[model samples]
Target: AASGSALIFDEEMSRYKLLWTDPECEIEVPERLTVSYEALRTHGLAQRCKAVPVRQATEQEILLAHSEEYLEAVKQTPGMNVEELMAFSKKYNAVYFHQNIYHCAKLAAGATLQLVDSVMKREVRNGMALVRPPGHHSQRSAANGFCVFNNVAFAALYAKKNYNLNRILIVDWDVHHGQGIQYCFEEDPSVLYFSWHRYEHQSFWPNLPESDYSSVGKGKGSGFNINLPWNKVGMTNSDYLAAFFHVLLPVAYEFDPELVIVSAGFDSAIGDPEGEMCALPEIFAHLTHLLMPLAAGKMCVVLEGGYNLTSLGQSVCQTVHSLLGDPTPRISGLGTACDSALESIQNVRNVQSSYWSSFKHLAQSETNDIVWPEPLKRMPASVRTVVVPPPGVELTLPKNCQHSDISESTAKEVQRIRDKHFHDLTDQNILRSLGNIISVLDRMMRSDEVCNGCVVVSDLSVSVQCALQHALTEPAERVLVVYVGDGELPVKTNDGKVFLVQICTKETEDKCVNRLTLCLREGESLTAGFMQALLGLILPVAYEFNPALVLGIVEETAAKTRLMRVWGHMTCLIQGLARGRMLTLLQGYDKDLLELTVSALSGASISPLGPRAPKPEDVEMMEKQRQRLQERWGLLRCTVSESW
Candidate 1:
């Protein structure tokens, strides 16, 4: 019920007249025509359909698809040498030219128009337009191969004009280039052209160097033209199916054409007398099945070039039988797998993903490096080394001293030492260990600063998380930490690492009031309690004994750590904001007009308030300070190895 349909075999279809004159052409004119004739001639009444002869259109009807000047010129130039004909056709962009070529060309055009009109009238659900002078390779004025007039091109133009169908698709699976159809609608968005031919390493006839995957059409039809060129021959059903599923179908879905036409060339079928192609014959039927759904039952197939009668006959019969819903025996054959066929699928996926956003979801297979097993043996260690910390009065204490004290300079040194030693670990535990080292170093070398000072907090987390939660919970009263001592702070966090935490002091009046304000704000909401805790403890200690001008170290561990930037930001914001003036909130803000400029300078994430609510003035001031910090940090960051 799903597949039964009528098949059209346009009886008058003939080879281009130039084929007789061109000795280099391999196909005998009768070979293809006779094969098509035989399929209809011997068809069983239940399975076979009568061949229809499409009459040649008058010069006026022919002119509908071609320029009058060009049509007349094609008629007059038939007698000239190939060189003269080539030059004449060059104006039309490489269309085929030969003696009396225009006559057969028009008949092919008429045959296609007939098939198109039949489908339009619904006299038949769908039909094939088996015509010659293959239209796809022909440009508007020029032609190539045995093709003179573009049969499919004329039908497409005729459909658009006569039938008023705007969205049509030309599904060309010819083994050669479809330059003509592509050229005709290369700029028109309404027509989507898909073609797959032999290419790569210059392995086929009439090779177009521009047929690469990146050559998607320009302008309004940017991605409408899809070309999938294979490398060497030997493509099977899987190869074709892979292209259909991964590249072609996804793009076609995006284009969503109303009508679909097939430039069905069977040259790639197994045993075809042209080239070394070996595609399974059943693939034609399978391909037909695939296109049926996409075309919304409005589909037509046109005969192109398939010289070998044995394979070509089988291919046509199976295609027709499948379409007519009369089950036909599958072609018994085998086609070798092509390596490039697989690669072509990948190449298309890569190229399509670059242009279309939806293609970003395409799937890829992962590869493993281990192919063979290793011999059962082990090597002995031959080298030894010793590591020692700088001499200091080592203090023995309880496991609670697991948290060691560190000055800002010592904290930096400890980071350098760890980076030099354990550079390969990218786990978050390593980052948490790094953080703990800094916390301990701040408690140690800056003992005096921590004894009576404010804490300086970095806003690395703010840029990473949604700022609203932190903003609503705690107001980070800005504090300035001034460090008095010049000698580098000692860092002693663990046996394996060390870093410095600067001791700093902030202005007392601002510090005292901000601390009280955080505690009072705790009654407002749970978010307030979260903010109060950060400002109360960390802010004062960070401000009292500022160890250095810089507040936060650009830890390399952060880059390697497996942490979501937003989640980490949320963690830091909650930890600091909830506790109150425990640390300076000079680095981040909830909203700001100058946020983009600040983010640009600091290499940070800065957002302005939503349109519904005006940002508070304090948030605006915090953003200005962030801007200044970003500028200075940018200069420091530039001089460093790598800055994020």
Candidate 2:
């Protein structure tokens, strides 16, 4: 049977410690691993995870990322005396070696590889490896920043060699930059390396100019490397989220990867002296949850730099709980990005605009200065007026429509619409439930006060079919359906009265003339490039079609939060086009999720951030779909020569 989560840990990894005890290396202790693992076990989180045993990485595996000379030198560490050990420690910065350091580093790298193997082979969806001597800052020829071997770098090469994978994404969220990993893959395009470190304009440790935002990549790997340099301390959740939304997500979605590796480091969490940032522990949960949908939940988080024990344990537990499919804890104090963060985001975007098509528009938009009219002031006064009755008159709704109940005529009308457009709901109970939802949607469409409405049901297919059918009733000339998951649409119409845009993991045949499919691979989230297609193509087409009512259907998965965030952003942008006539259908009864969904749609929750870069194949497929339907949908083309 498949499990929800996995754990790769062993007591053997804690054997390596700082033998000499320099002030710089003293904080990187063995207790970091013990406290994190013990927290999981004590909280019952370890019991919930599939325990994958750790093993020693073989000589050949270690050689994958390190030179033979370096490997041979590390092998001789166990036999060295105190003098030799002290001399060897001087060769590497912030790295100390003990008699068992060689063996422990092998176990740490091996443990990470084991978790990668388990996830690749489908033993579990996602997992984390708790290892000592964190490996992100270790290079091919030398150890730096306490990392003996580049575990994540080796795992990337190993996955590509063994599994025949093409694209892999390594996200380093540690407080300091991983120059070793960057140097190893800086010239390779198959692997995208993104790192955000505490670089206060060359004042921080590992203060190399390569860690700056200007060092994108070399040769074919140009633009594949993303560096976000924080010029100041006190960065908070808003700053982190702003980076993901404006910079990271837009490019990541465009460069869709088959595997995602997180260099999971908690040094960036609150209370960490190194990071000096104010981001709380719950922020890690949100970050993990946001990335869960990528690669079909095939994410591997390896332990890296976390100094403060209290925040490290709490942050690790939050990430593990998210991998176990727990509800994302609500975050507070998210207002706007700090000025420093905004500067970093814009600088990276500007530097990367030439390499990615997604950033092209943003770059061009910034160069041109234009004045726009205020939205409310542009609207005609008569069109915005709402009339009220005299005080003496008492208004009463029909008996059936007084409460939440559906009226007799409304039910009959729904059945008629269902029979005409969607004949799939054969079960009476399902049809009746759909009818109740349709009545609510009808009320929302007629009233301007209700900007959006959400309905949770057992069968999403039936609810979506009913919603689409009901949306085409009188006063609603056309309906736009946005499907965000896998399912079959029951629409058999060839007319342009109903337009459909399906964003799913796979593509299917659509007989309708006004339908277009945007297929994303499993585990892939909507990245900024995908958002470009949405705002530039999807929104334009939607407005041109002038949909009377917009309906969206989403499945209950980790992607639900992402889908809701997209919908919230889309609805806000489309309010003028659709007049705030929207209905969202969720496919579960989780009360907490429902409340969050409602809050998101009502503009009460933090807006969704992060966009994935679309794969070339997916982009080509989307372009073909757009070309096929462009004759009927004129706004699908962004330019005269637009192939998309």
Candidate 3:
């Protein structure tokens, strides 16, 4: 319901830096916060965000996640001398104490609380707090890993007690484990904590055994805490994407959280000395987009750990770009996860399958020398949504949408083509609907501001073929088609320029690597279950396929409310590909469905599907399908224990 994005940054959070010469902690500098916010400003992202001020988090707020004794100990540091600070610093691991650290830590934690307040109160849809004295690795009673009061953990605790949030999702993509947050939520079923860190088999920092994939959670929180350890460094964008596909996204969708909080860490991005991973900053853009649809778009990203100033700044700008609802940038080489990443993925899936049915179906890499080119600059199309109404069908639209071209040129072209295809189709409705196919294509072709469009049609076969013929004729090639209808397709993908995934009550567009056909069991409805196919099959395939444009085709569904909602989620998710260029052809009359499609394309929230087990048979079907396609679409490789 909130209309704008919030940016919580106060100079106070950047006032304290690592005082000693700890090589491990020196990278944790004040510039981490200054450069991140400056990057946001220089990129023109800061001015777009509603600037929310920060404050000192009350001791009562600090105690929400920390010990009172720990609070008083940090409070005394403000008056301490340098020797006293150095002596105090020895009490913690990889953390430092400055005279002003107590104040800065309070500001860091409070800045996150400020973001939480803005998001929770609907003053802003979502936000990021560029904080220092990075939280996450700090523990309940002791400071560690350059964190003092545990900013994110404090925000989560405060949200639960203050906002009474029950099902909150905390996603830690930081390269290091957030032992503090895990410890705080390990026994709490109400919170779902998912972290993917560079574990290297307990050799990474703070190398706790619980940081492995086996530590699901403790007591009532069993399975609620998910750890996907990157046992090997040099983990690329593909590894991170695979983790979401097989591990995080499914369970997260099932959890159906009320609020989403991110431990937004950029150290995991490329060229970071801390992470030693190869993922690009643009990967964060795609990851942020994937999570935006969850929790009804109520997400707060709190800064945690990022050392490389270049990587940190780029990652921050990319993330805030997503929060601003810009079309996500194109990401490449998402083809494979290394052997070690796969092992960690399977270990986590097998361990958590008992708790989440998304994993219950069970069943279930490459070169570091392969340098990934920097992602192209991402610019949001000024006009986000386009619509072409069927003749005599009065369609209304929200702000920021434009009606497609109506010069009768599109109508004339359709009539000329329809004589051979639709066989002398004469009705105005049929002509206008068919014309919209050309209209949307020509509009998107002509304008950079046009991101995606929705057009109503009477037939899927004819319209889909028309859309494809037009799309293929252009030099702007590499198109991916997702056809969701029972009718026989009137299109082909044999040439390899087009990749089509036919999703019907279906299998053979071909056994070709570029195209796939996915089906649910005959009895299953279009509930959250389709998410299995979407996450495991569709997303992985699309990412590896790496198309420049996407076209989605859907026949009217019998499952009205849920189907539309689920499809909306799918539309929003897939738009992350191809630089957000997409157009969907909706056959039959369902204005609500039409509106939902438009909403998703334009970055509106869809109601979250409450957490539950998808139909068991459907999950099994997807698992077996992933097994068949894993080698070809490497992101689908969840495990080495491949049994179809």
Candidate 4:
């Protein structure tokens, strides 16, 4: 049994290229395969991997996904002239054919099978196949989307039929929906298919309404099909990470697949004209690493769509590096999710919340009750604009507020007094001792002299509730409390005057009006989907409600490292959005770390903490919470529906 990454490729597949000039088909060139292979070789990654040979897929193997008639028609293309090839290409959308295309397509399919076999048979820990005439869009009867044969679909069916594998996870990151793959397994519950495509609300190519997130699956496969449609272009690394964290991952771990197949498309990387996405090349390293832990290291990555030779080569190398067990490249810009990306994330979660138990906590009744307004030709500028503060401004305490120092004896006395009054302050004495801190919060909300303040507390729950109570009594119309971490908060009132949004590490049964609870899997990082909830759902609701004070609370002990990074970024961004009228309370955190966080929030620091890749469960939790609150918070729904 092989124990390292497997490399499967053959230069023979390069022989199949577009002989005629078609703009759409031209980008799907031979170089997409050769350059990737060259990168693996040039970077010394290929030599480190277990090299495997390619062979022609048997007729029976191809029949797993394609019909005999379609195979027969493809066979006739081998003898066709240039004119006949051009004629044959017309039958499919964005596909070209040559005299040797059928031969190469068979090799591509076989190459995929070779890698699948390598991983499944324990010949290799994981593998990658650099094959062209990319498959994923090709249907059972015809070539489509530059795909002559559905290589991945064929491999999947083959894996199931031959190996008797039960739960195979097909992850399509092609930036284009693999309608062919979905069509094949949409009725089968055994295979869970997840795809995120460049969908500008059904305006992009392949333009099918079924490509939207609502198309979960049919019959027994209802929760098995996952589609994340990118509603706009120029989606970044944050957007991609968000989808993986929020939509794909949670269900994936729950599905607990025995085999994993990736339709690894690099077109979603930066500089690709088709995808128009801004994901950096190194992002692939993180994406690949996220899936490496599953299936006992049994995974196969097959080439799909990717142009932009430079980015393609780099992206492929990054993927291979991860497959070879290299550490993931550090990612930057973990600040926020773009507006369009946020809208798409929220919408998909809203539609898919019903089928999976992972999303069972999502408010189904509220999502159904949402009433969309008339379609706007264009969204408002305020809705689109995200205010990001420039770095390196000095932060000073407000004139009326001063930091307080309490002795150990004083702290104990404060706790004793608070325990007698506030019943929710269970074993929490930190807030009671900070007399000046509560005054600072009130002054920041009322005086407009201070924009933001950071307070270190012993009890996160007690401090937050105390702040909420203080703000509600002030002249401010409403108060917005954002809690990140698990703790208790009193359900003081059902009035819309106090809005609470909690991001916790686990799910809870507690329900309250004007409150949204996002439960992430333990140790999961904060991804773009969480940012979407902040930008798309939380911010909009907060602004619309016109909250006079914005309060953020973080629990020091329970905070995961990646989540802490997310909180740092969120606090910085939220301070700007709130016009400095924000107060952050940190409980059980070190003084130095709290100071650094405060400096970042004040724009006094240049390098702030960036978020890490999120687990799938985190995304599902955020999605569920967003759907439940969308009706109550109208801004949460970014897309308009006909019936609504």
Candidate 5:
């Protein structure tokens, strides 16, 4: 009932086309809408979406973020004569008006609200509205920069008032600063607004000094307003990617918005003259894909600005394709972000680190080198968790789970492989354990489900060995095995095809490639210093490693640990790195633990650990580890190693 992109485009909006000569406003054409809608139609995406229509924003609705006086004045232009229309148009900056302008502006703003309604009521998972006279630059007073009503800003207030969505996130990725939206919600606490625009240190269009990273927001809204202005043009795919990974993604994960609204603008794409940016159209697909794992699929993307029709149309297609559940092509060979981008990133982190808990350690800010393949467009089995339970367990998994029992013929095939792993493996119990591990490995191997888990006979050794060996045998370039427990530890010799990082209760030494171990003093601990390890050590190393498959094994003893919440959060974030090609193994199926991990695999957001500081000792120890491994693990090095 809730898995289609509620695409909004109505021919009635075509009536807003320019009827006169306004050279400054010519590029904001109807084709920006018509051509985009046609691209979707031609790309066969239109038919896939849940089509939703647009309507005129009522006077009261228009007043949600606009001034009453401004609305009253704009309301009189619908039937005005040509001279009067020209006169009204001249009153605003970078804007034009036709007799039908008022009507069109109302629909552009309402289209975003329509998308909000669709996603809010569970009629659709998420949506994008092809709106014109884009709203990000429009403000509470006079229309500015070809914008009438602030579509993104208005929609934010509408959601809270109508649906009571308390925390809202607006990601304005336009090439220019949405100063209007920023100014409107600059001081509001409930709405968290983030924008990255092309700013040449007050040299570009709308060159407001406040657009710099220094404007953290006033009083109550402090830190909620995130602005990263690119001081230079020609920003590449890597630059934007670095920004999100270092700034937006970490903070958003902590904010945990109830609804996500992207001020979708294409001027930032390559070949666009307005922003003169170099980020490719394909990057939007990745950007859209990145945001999907958040907000639990409640995202509304409203178009803002783009002049290059070719790039604009393609970018829109990319965004809609991901929204329509297409796999985004994997981005390989992302370089270190430019010095300018890094300087901006670190400064913003340093400034806003006070507000967000996730950025507390990252206030200074951070990457790695890895090459990967284009992601396969497998059916995204969201909320679908495949499980392989041991024999005679007689268990039914959660509502979203599929029992992956081996067939009679498949079991014999499974038996032959089990014999190869261990001698005299005829016992059905251990045989079943090996079978289930292989079954789950194959489930994720074929992309049958987003992720899968298994229950073993508490041996943990057999399952971990089966998982690592079977995974390494794949055609993949490498595998990353994450072990969490005090077990015999299979695959200690990384062997160039696998990277191992084990969490055991001992500070043991080992001889292997890419092998590292950490413990929380003595007795098991998950909360005190675990996250410091997760965010600081595990994530950075895993990200840099860029594995083909991530095999996570939580030993029976550790699976029952109170870190269930923490475990679920780790699963949610790590799956992003592998593009859902993850296989999690647990020897014990702790009810709450398994369900939560499965939910995370299903693209669900887990409870936030907030900004709570881990044990200071853990922080100090993590620093020491990072210092020792930063060169080998570049992402682990957060600060600028070679400062000016």
Candidate 6:
């Protein structure tokens, strides 16, 4: 596996307090901020990069970038309080702030200094710092765009000062312009600033006077600054690639900065609420992939501005994937890139050649090789088609993988997995019986009659009593229950007066001939049809016994009401029996309930024979009923059914 580590900062604990207590500003951090960060962290998606706590630069460092008078104003403005801060912030078009602004400002700057430490130490190939109060829009003297300190600018200077390094590049990929950094380095040849932001006639915020391509840099730093402002929304993945290919890539390669810092704002991604321009999540990864190879993989990405959670998360994931050298995850089939975004790439490339000398050379060589066309003839040829082709360069990377003989190992693993889940398919009869029981239960649970019944049978137990009790307690003279059971378990209602009908099986005669025959002739309509049809439909079913003859005699002998109850009892009995783990005869009281309900409903009690126990109360009731109906229908034999 590839290697990486993360550092969690305690910044979150104090962030809210800092945002609220700032007497000079009104920027309130949203309450959901911590929760959202935690959610991403909890899912193991993002890890914090360790940061330092550096104070705001002394007046000397400020002088390195800012004007003395502008610095004096910021230092003196705090005493004016909330009203004053708001006015100043509005004038600068920046977010709120506080008296301790100097302290917070240093921490932001220090955050990137620590990022440089990690890069120098090779603790990671590259790392990202999710700093708040984004820093790109701040100019040299005044903090703007809710930015107190130019964090990336300060960090870049710190790297050059402390590390004795030179020729650093700052790639501002944020949707907003990086005027602060660009202005700070506008006249310095040691720094190269490249920015692509929404410039469509200053439709974007913080409209900069010097963000156009023609402005480039002045004096010694002339042509070091690169700006390609986008003119439209819906920036497709291809458009971003083309911008890099035609403008950013070719020029950056020629300059060949020693170190690269990314002002990575996720706001430009598709579905972001902050901006109208839309780039796919993969484009961010692609940007990293393209730039990482340069500068010998020396890169540090600092968070800029992205408010949308979905695009933010996806873009971060893609960035991490790119850092790991993984291919971008494919967008779902429903996603599509817009043609408007692709056209914007062409437009940006056309405007960039004025400052970037390689624009035409790249257009003739790389552009023609790729899909984009040549620049317009009206464009000046002196726009500089400078090209420093690589000197017969061949790049090779050592393989970091080990080949393994996996065929044999995979076969063993497959067998192991299969053995864990596989079960022998012997004992077909038992399997078939279990299947029948499951089908019957499944149907009963779905059936409207039982599902919606007033006193419906619920399984083979207690619910049956509750539903029956509710029904029997009603004022109606008679109650009808359509019972359905999962398996073979006879259940009795709370009120013993109501009848019972149980569909014992779903098997047809061909499946379970004896049971099917018994069910059809002797059972109620539901049980009869269910069993008959099930057996008829299934194949390879066996029947050793035929109980159809016995069913006929019992049907003729029993009254309609008696037959219905017998069927209901069997329906409940089957619920308990359908479960293959428990033997049909061993479900204890449930099996007894089935026998008792059938005897009570059909006027059929077991004879005092074999090893069966006698039910004294049931016997007494039978005697009384027999005597009461003796005169009207003659004496009947108290004999159990032959099958029982």
Best by lDDT: 3
List model 6 lDDT by residue over 37-130, tens digit each: 5544653545433333333356665565567777777776547576666566666654665565655555556666677766756665566665
The 0-to-1 C-alpha lDDT of every candidate, in the order given, reads 0.47, 0.71, 0.83, 0.70, 0.75, 0.46
What TM-score, over all chains together, does every model reach? 0.51, 0.65, 0.95, 0.61, 0.86, 0.51
lDDT of 6: 0.46
Tens-place lDDT digits, model 1, residues 206-254: 6666676667788987877777888777666545655664466545544
List the candidate numbers ranked by TM-score, top first. Answer: 3, 5, 2, 4, 6, 1
Better of 2 and 5 by lDDT: 5
Q: Between 3 and 6, whose lDDT is larger? A: 3
Which runs in model 3 stand beyond 4 Å of their true positions? Answer: 363-374, 408-428, 506-510, 522-526, 557-562, 641-644
Q: Could you tell which candidate, 5 or 6, scores higher by lDDT?
A: 5
Which ranges of candidate 1 are over 4 A from the true structure?
1-11, 15-23, 45-52, 58-65, 77-100, 328-337, 354-358, 362-644
Highest TM-score: give the candidate number. 3
lDDT of 5 by residue, 1-644 (tens): 36678999987776776667878788888888888989888788888898898987788888889889999898899878888888898898888877787888889888888999999998998999988778888888889988888889889999989998778999999998999989988888888899999998989878799999888788899988999989889898767876776678767766778889999999998888798888877788868876776667788999999988888888888898778655444454555567778778878978887887555664443311112222234345653567655555555455666666666755775666766767666666777776777777766665554454544445667767777777777565677787888756767553566777777776665544387676665323346466557655776667667777878788777776555546766775566455556777777756666667667665554554543445444555566676777667655544455775
lDDT tens digits, residue span 56-159, model 3 = 89978888888888888888999998889999999889889998888888888889999999999989999999888888988878999888888888878889
Cα lDDT tens digits for candidate 2, 1-644: 23567799998878877766588988898899999999887667888899999999999999999999999999999999877988998999878998998999999899989988999998898899999889999998898998999999988999999999888999999999999889989999989999998899989989899999898899989998999999999888767765665566556656767788999889998888788887877667767755665565678999999988888888888888768754344343354466677677768877888787666543553321212221111111111211111123233421111223568887787678678856675776566567667666756666543445566565776677667766776567777887777766676447777777777766676655577677654435445435655654575466557677777666766344444445544544443234445676766554545554454343231333533454555455555665676566543432233236
Give the alpha carbon lDDT tens digit for every residue of 1-644 in model 4: 33688999999999878887777777878887788888877788888888899999999888888899999999999889999988988987888898888999999999999998888888788989999779999999989998878888988898998899888999999889999999999999989999999989899999999999889899988889988888888887667766765566656755767888999998898888889888888768767755655576578999898888888888888888767654344343443356677667767777677765445445454423111121111111111111111122233532223343445654564465476766465443455425435556545554544445666676555556666766666565667778877767763547777777778766785575488777655444445446545544565555445555677777776454545645554554454233446667776645455655565444331232222334555555555665676556544444442243
What is candidate 2's TM-score against the reference? 0.65
- Ranked by lDDT from best down, the candidates are 3, 5, 2, 4, 1, 6
Q: Number of backbone collisions per candidate, in order?
A: 73, 15, 0, 6, 0, 27
**What C-alpha RMSD separates each model from the true structure?**
25.6, 14.8, 3.4, 14.1, 4.5, 32.5
- Pairs in clash, predicted candidate 3: none
- Please give the lDDT score for candidate 3: 0.83
Report how far residue 261 has shifted in candidate 4, in Å.
Answer: 0.4
